[PDB]
Design a protein around this nucleic acid. Structure first.
Lengths: 157, 227, 365, 122, 124
RNA sequence: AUUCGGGUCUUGUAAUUGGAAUGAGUACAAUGUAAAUACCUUAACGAGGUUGGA
């Protein structure tokens, strides 16, 4: 069923990113209010449409948001769900070499290692923005990330 | 080794020394290959191996193209002839009787098409922009097949325009849909649907829609008949 | 802590005394001058550190002592360099000179014996040292590195104090005065950043302006910037940057955009601009000097209203790739390290009069 | 330079170098002009990256022509030293190719679509 | 349910005639209703068969037609407008299980659930 | 969904590698119930084992 094949979809996103639950639920609801309140544009350019504009538009974000356009951020309702997902270390920290493959990643995110330019960040679902600083930090030292720096060419997206 | 005919004219399959099956065409210019392809003699007749990973037509065949409108003595207008890979295979298929008109607007590449077209009386090279069929109106004739593989966002529209100039009523159009050069943002599968609709909202009768995967990522080929 | 030195108009630049001193080394990457008997220190890709007496403005720099590193020193806490030395800074107290480069080590040497007294590793496999700057009248050292971090040190503790984060590319150049703060440039991030160490805050200034956009707003009445490469602080409230499109920009801490821009400051030679490869504002004055590989050192004067700068003159004996500029006084003496190559290995087609050594210019009034 | 077909703004150039690094880590890349060539000739490459400061220009001049025949998108970066050093090398490289993007799929798809826009298209 | 997904914004939604009538004579903003529930750009369309059927209804119930002929729904040019609305949508979605269907015809919905990957919308 | 066709092709080791994974104890003063102030925060010292279907 659509319920069913949905309960498929979710499990698809279940490592289309990396989660293990219904943080897909988290991000989901997010997308709602984002849209929702947003989609409640409605309306005109009410000086409100204004602040809210460059406002929610300043969703960008880094690793987050879109790229360069809008206005119409319902695109996100498409993305966000399927985009807001990445961004955060939960995603955009495998896609940077260090992490051998999502799993082999969250584990260091937790397990002390993996730190955002000073200070670790166990919160294994932070968010990224101006990333170039997402190194190991470590402070004999964070091993799994300090030598397996095959990320020395992690020119990815 | 063994070579034998297939459901489609002048298109053959090989049994190999090891037990592999690969497409090939009957070599119009024996002893001579256009890209690096393997030349194969069987019962004193030479065939050119047709690599599916390079040629979209070979791909579409291997993905089960019902009926191929390109055969012996067919007249084709080939939009986006490039270096001559695929067009050389349609030259083999069409034989001296038929004719291929290769339109291509990148000089860097028509350079290498020239070499292919010198050796082959079938092929009539044209350095022109497929967006202006007026600029080759005066060299071409009307045709049976409009084979269209051009990297352009409005590729479909270009194809329809050439069609109402050159495609015979009840002729066929093989149109390659390049998702990533129409829009890298959109889903390839949403693109295939909306482009086909352009053909239908003109008057092309969608016969078959193939997905070129393994062989070509984010590509689909449409076969349809102009009315 | 502002600009109070107005000698720009007094400078007898046209009648400057110019000299050059060859070195047997390949590719000086940096020069550091000490000012209370005056000293200069040079470092090279050839792993040589060299000390000169420059106190006699009548004669060329007098070589006193040298120390050469090498393969022997492969580990990184050995007391010698084994990969390209990229930067050198003399301590304001006269006691220390510290070097750093591609072997991810700071090495602090005594000026007395030219011997390593302490080696402080960056502890990162990507932490190459790209630039050094002491806080003036202090032992506090700032090292800009290739892993996007700026590391701070207390030199008479021989320790690392902290690490600063913000840049999104290599931190090519760093400049500091007397305040506990510094300016850095991030190359391809096209930002300059002002670090207020005690306030734990930082200002961010952005370049990388689209030429089509610039032209579009100029029609209200040029060259693409891909990297901001050099930086120098003129006072505690202003600084200058130099880019690989020839732009020399004057910035105020209060403004988001540059308060003034001199485009293609070193000219061109379809069109390619000369990069700014060297930039030194003499502290709290209205003069600064710029260098490229175009054959001359341009000396500029800042307005008294700090809203512009203007070309004072040229020092045309300076052929080669200028890698670093320093100015000492007693009479001004400009010293500049000249190499056949760019400090960092950026590729340079035809450098005219390519050579290895130290350019000197003595200017009166 | 003349083998450069279109203009790449530095933001994109940096997003390319990033895309390559993540592809070393999580996917499969090819590095060097000959290997890049073979990757195009074989149709394996999804994105081709060409440096702008190649010193005889003609060394990579065949790539735009070749990529168009095989319909593989290509992009420029300004430094060959920077592309090689991205690639996981300590020496320069004139051209490279991404065969499988891995954890850069999203990042690549944005590039192959920005170079479409600043090329024409829609 | 073993169904591989590839849906991308904007969703393509076929609106049937019953839904159109319904939303009209109860003042329900059909367009915004779909953007709300799909939480993304939607292209809202109606087959020629559905709108034809409306056309007949329109002879005594004016108002559905205008909304139904609005650009918001864009016409899907089917080859068979003569086939009941139900069968029309079914034969169009049977080859394109891609499009979402908004219908008040619980009979049409039941037989569409059969096809994997068909979002189904309706008004309570 | 298969009925036969089709799809194509890793998958098992109740095989052999990975770090000095980590957890838990030990001063550790302590924002600190001036005594809670070893229980916090450190720091470390040490330290991985529902359903349906035979």
């Amino acid at each position: 069923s659509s319920r069913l094949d949905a309960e498929l979809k979710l499990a698809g996103e279940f490592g289309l990113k990396n989660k293990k639950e219904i943080y897909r639920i988290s991000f989901q609801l997010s997308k709602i209010r984002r849209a929702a309140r947003d989609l409640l544009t409605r309306d005109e350019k009410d000086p409100k449409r204004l602040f809210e504009g460059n406002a929610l538009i300043r969703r960008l974000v880094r690793v987050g948001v879109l790229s360069e356009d809008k206005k119409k951020l319902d695109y996100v309702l498409a993305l966000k769900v399927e985009d807001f997902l990445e961004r955060r270390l939960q995603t955009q920290v495998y896609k940077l070499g260090l992490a051998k493959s999502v799993h082999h990643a969250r584990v260091l995110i937790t397990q002390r290692h993996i730190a955002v330019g000073k200070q670790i960040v166990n919160i294994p679902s932070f968010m990224v923005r101006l990333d170039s600083e997402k190194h190991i930090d470590f402070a004999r030292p964070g091993r799994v990330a300090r030598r397996n720096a095959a990320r020395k060419a992690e020119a990815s997206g | 080794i063994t070579v034998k005919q297939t459901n489609m004219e002048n298109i053959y399959e090989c049994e190999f020394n090891d037990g592999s099956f690969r497409l090939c065409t009957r070599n119009l210019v024996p002893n001579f290959n256009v890209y690096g392809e393997r030349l194969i003699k069987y019962e004193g007749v030479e065939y050119r191996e047709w690599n599916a990973f390079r040629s979209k037509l070979a791909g579409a065949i291997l993905k089960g193209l019902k009926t191929n409108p390109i055969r012996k003595g067919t007249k084709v207008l080939y939009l986006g002839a490039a270096s001559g890979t695929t067009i050389s295979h349609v030259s083999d298929i069409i034989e001296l009787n038929g004719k291929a008109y290769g339109v291509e607007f990148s000089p860097r590449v028509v350079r290498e098409l020239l070499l292919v077209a010198q050796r082959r009386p079938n092929i009539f090279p044209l350095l022109a922009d497929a967006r202006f069929p007026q600029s080759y109106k005066s060299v071409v004739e009307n045709v049976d097949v409009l084979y269209v593989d051009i990297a352009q966002p409005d590729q479909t529209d270009i194809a329809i325009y050439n069609a109402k100039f050159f495609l015979k009523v009840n002729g066929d159009m093989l149109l390659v849909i390049k998702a990533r050069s129409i829009d890298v943002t959109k889903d390839p599968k949403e693109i295939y649907k909306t482009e086909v609709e352009k053909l239908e909202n003109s008057n092309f009768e969608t016969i078959q829609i193939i997905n070129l995967d393994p062989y070509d990522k984010d590509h689909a080929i449409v076969l349809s008949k102009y009315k | 802590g502002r600009v109070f030195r107005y000698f720009g108009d007094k400078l007898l630049i046209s009648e400057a005394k110019q000299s050059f001193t060859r070195v047997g080394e390949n590719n000086l990457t940096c020069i550091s001058c000490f000012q209370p008997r005056l000293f200069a220190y040079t470092v090279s890709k050839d792993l040589q550190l060299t000390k000169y007496d420059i106190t006699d403005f009548s004669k060329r720099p007098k070589k006193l002592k040298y120390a050469k590193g090498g393969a022997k020193y492969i580990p990184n806490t050995t007391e010698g360099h084994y990969d390209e030395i990229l930067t050198v800074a003399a301590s304001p107290d006269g006691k220390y000179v510290v070097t750093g480069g591609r072997d991810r080590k700071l090495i602090v040497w005594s000026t007395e014996s030219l011997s390593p007294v302490k080696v402080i590793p960056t502890k990162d496999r990507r932490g190459e040292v790209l630039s050094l700057a002491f806080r003036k009248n202090s032992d506090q050292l700032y090292a800009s590195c290739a892993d996007f971090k700026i590391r701070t040190y207390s030199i008479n503790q021989f320790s690392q104090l902290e690490i600063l984060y913000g840049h999104h590319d290599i931190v090519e150049d760093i400049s500091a005065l007397a305040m506990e703060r510094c300016v850095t440039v991030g190359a391809r991030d096209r930002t300059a950043m002002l670090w207020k160490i005690p306030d734990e805050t930082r200002l961010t200034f952005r370049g990388g302006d689209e030429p089509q956009k610039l032209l579009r707003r100029w029609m209200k009445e040029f060259f693409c910037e891909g990297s901001i490469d050099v930086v120098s602080m003129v006072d505690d409230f202003h600084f200058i940057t130099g880019s690989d499109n020839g732009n020399i920009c004057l910035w105020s801490l209060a403004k988001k955009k540059p308060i003034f821009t001199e485009r293609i400051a070193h000219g061109i030679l379809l069109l390619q601009p000369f990069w700014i490869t060297s930039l030194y504002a003499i502290p709290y004055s209205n003069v600064f000097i710029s260098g490229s590989w175009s054959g001359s050192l341009k000396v500029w004067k800042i307005s008294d209203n700090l809203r512009s700068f203007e070309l004072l003159g040229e020092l045309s004996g300076a052929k080669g790739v200028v890698t670093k500029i320093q100015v000492v006084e007693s009479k001004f003496r400009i010293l500049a390290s000249i190499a056949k190559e760019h400090r960092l290995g950026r590729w340079i087609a035809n450098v005219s009069g390519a050579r290895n050594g130290i350019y000197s210019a003595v200017i009166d009034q | 330079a003349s083998y450069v077909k279109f203009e790449v703004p530095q933001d994109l150039a940096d997003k390319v170098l990033e895309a390559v690094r993540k592809a070393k880590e999580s996917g499969k890349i090819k590095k060097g002009t000959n290997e890049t060539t073979k990757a195009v000739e074989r149709g394996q490459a999804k994105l081709v990256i060409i440096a702008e400061d190649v010193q005889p220009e003609e060394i990579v001049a065949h790539l735009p022509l070749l990529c168009d025949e095989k319909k593989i998108p290509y992009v420029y970066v300004s430094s060959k030293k920077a592309l090689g050093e991205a690639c996981g090398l300590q020496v320069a490289t004139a051209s490279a190719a991404i065969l499988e993007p891995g954890e850069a799929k999203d990042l690549v798809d944005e590039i192959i679509k920005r170079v479409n826009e600043i090329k024409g298209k829609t | 349910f073993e169904h591989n997904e590839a849906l991308v914004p904007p969703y393509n939604v076929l609106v049937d005639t019953n839904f159109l009538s319904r939303t009209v004579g109860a003042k329900l903003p059909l367009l915004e209703s779909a953007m709300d529930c799909l939480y993304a750009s939607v292209n809202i369309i109606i087959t020629s068969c559905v709108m034809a059927e409306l056309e007949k209804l329109g002879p005594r119930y004016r108002v559905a037609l205008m909304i139904a002929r609005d650009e918001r729904w864009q016409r899907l040019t089917c080859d068979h407008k003569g086939t009941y609305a139900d069968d029309c949508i079914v034969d169009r979605v049977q080859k394109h299980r891609i499009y979402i269907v908004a219908t008040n015809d619980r009979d049409l919905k039941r037989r569409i659930r059969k096809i994997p990957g068909v979002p189904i919308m309706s008004v309570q």
